[PDB]
């Protein structure tokens, strides 16, 4: 359960600090609080994780305003996908996702930056007009699961993180952050859509937001 935490804190960070060599990570920014690591799964997938201990969506630190906006940092890190792709990856192809504890195996905060599934891309595009600033179930859900969705502008994202908005806006999400998985996708009008899904026995929802991603990048 601790391999990623050990890589970050015992390999990347010390190597960055000692030789300015982020290996095995792609980038290590101690002053900003994050690292970027190539994932072993998928040709373009990267992970964005903190340079200090935060275990996942359940961590209380995520609901503190001083905590770095990891989702926005992951968004910026989408360029690592383009570098591996060898050319610019269109924004519409990228998706960011974090899984809850029942939908993950590693206990160190990590956002999956990878390609969005084509069906999810279309499903989101078709509901542009239904996605507002208030969290509301996405019509049709995604992958057979209920997903609350919210429209957000880049300006809003720099002000607050998706976790802050989930906690401040959705009933009882504040006292059950760990039961949620969240994702971020950019919409056709250049705004973004935030997605939140909660663990649910009946629909077999493990709150694994990564399910909207296709690490084999067929959308490209």
């Amino acid at each position: 359960s601790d391999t990623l935490r050990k890589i970050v804190l015992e390999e990347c960070l010390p190597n960055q600090q000692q030789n300015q060599n982020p290996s095995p990570c792609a980038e290590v920014k101690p002053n900003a609080g994050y690292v970027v690591l190539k994932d072993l799964n998928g040709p373009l997938q990267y992970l964005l994780m903190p340079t200090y201990r935060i275990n996942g969506t359940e961590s209380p630190l995520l609901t503190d305003p001083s905590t770095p906006n990891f989702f926005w940092l992951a968004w910026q890190a989408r360029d690592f996908m383009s570098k591996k792709y060898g050319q610019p990856v269109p924004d519409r192809a990228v998706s960011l996702a974090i899984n809850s504890r029942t939908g993950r195996t590693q206990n160190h905060f990590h956002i999956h930056i990878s390609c969005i599934r084509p069906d999810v891309r279309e499903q989101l595009d078709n509901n542009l007009a239904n996605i507002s600033s208030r969290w509301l179930p996405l019509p049709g859900g995604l992958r057979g699961h209920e997903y609350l969705a919210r429209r957000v502008t880049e300006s809003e994202l720099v002000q607050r993180s998706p976790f802050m908005m989930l906690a401040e806006e959705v009933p009882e999400a504040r006292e059950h952050m760990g039961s949620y998985g969240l994702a971020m996708v950019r919409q056709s009008d250049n705004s973004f859509v935030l997605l939140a899904t909660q663990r649910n026995l009946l629909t077999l929802n493990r709150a694994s937001a990564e399910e909207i991603q296709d690490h084999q990048c067929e959308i490209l």
Side-chain angles (χ1 to χ4, degrees):
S1 301
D2 213 62
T3 300
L4 290 178
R5 180 191 289 159
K6 283 186 174 170
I7 285 165
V8 178
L9 325 180
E10 296 180 52
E11 295 181 65
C12 296
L13 191 54
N15 197 185
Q16 176 53 57
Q17 284 291 305
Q18 186 69 298
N19 325 305
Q20 305 181 313
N21 182 307
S23 66
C25 291
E27 193 186 72
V28 177
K29 301 300 300 184
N31 40 304
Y34 79 89
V35 306
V36 176
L37 179 76
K38 177 68 182 69
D39 201 289
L40 299 182
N41 183 40
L44 301 179
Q45 175 173 37
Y46 281 85
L47 289 174
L48 185 140
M49 313 178 262
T51 46
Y52 55 101
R53 292 161 72 89
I54 301 187
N55 294 3
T57 67
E58 71 268 21
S59 174
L61 314 193
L62 296 184
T63 56
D64 163 347
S66 321
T67 295
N69 191 342
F70 298 116
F71 260 98
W72 186 251
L73 288 173
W75 178 251
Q76 299 298 272
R78 69 190 185 296
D79 265 52
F80 279 95
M81 294 182 57
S82 297
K83 299 189 233 267
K84 185 59 77 74
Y85 190 39
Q87 76 186 74
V89 173
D91 284 353
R92 300 189 18 102
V94 183
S95 58
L96 310 165
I98 182 166
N99 303 320
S100 77
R101 209 188 60 166
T102 51
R104 80 194 191 209
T105 87
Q106 295 298 300
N107 287 322
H108 189 71
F109 186 99
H110 60 284
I111 293 172
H112 297 268
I113 303 158
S114 197
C115 296
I116 193 172
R117 288 174 50 101
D119 59 354
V120 172
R121 174 73 275 174
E122 184 156 11
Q123 278 149 13
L124 290 174
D125 293 343
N126 290 336
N127 247 244
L128 179 72
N130 298 311
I131 300 163
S132 69
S133 88
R134 290 288 182 171
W135 295 86
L136 294 166
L138 189 67
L142 295 175
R143 309 305 308 286
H145 299 320
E146 296 166 49
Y147 270 73
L148 290 184
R150 220 218 103 163
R151 175 207 178 77
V152 287
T153 67
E154 309 226 320
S155 64
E156 290 176 88
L157 275 298
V158 72
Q159 289 308 306
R160 298 285 175 173
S161 73
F163 303 103
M164 292 295 328
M165 294 176 220
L166 180 69
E168 290 300 310
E169 294 154 26
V170 291
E172 324 161 330
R174 222 223 186 192
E175 71 189 0
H176 307 295
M177 292 302 281
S179 73
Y180 283 90
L182 300 198
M184 187 166 133
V185 181
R186 195 168 199 174
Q187 311 199 91
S188 68
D189 54 9
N190 266 51
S191 68
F192 290 79
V193 56
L194 302 180
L195 300 162
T197 195
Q198 183 176 47
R199 192 170 190 289
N200 187 266
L201 173 58
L202 188 45
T203 59
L204 216 83
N205 201 324
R206 307 188 63 123
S208 177
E210 174 186 7
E211 67 185 355
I212 71 164
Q213 307 187 304
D214 164 27
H215 305 313
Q216 299 303 316
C217 295
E218 189 70 1
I219 197 169
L220 294 179

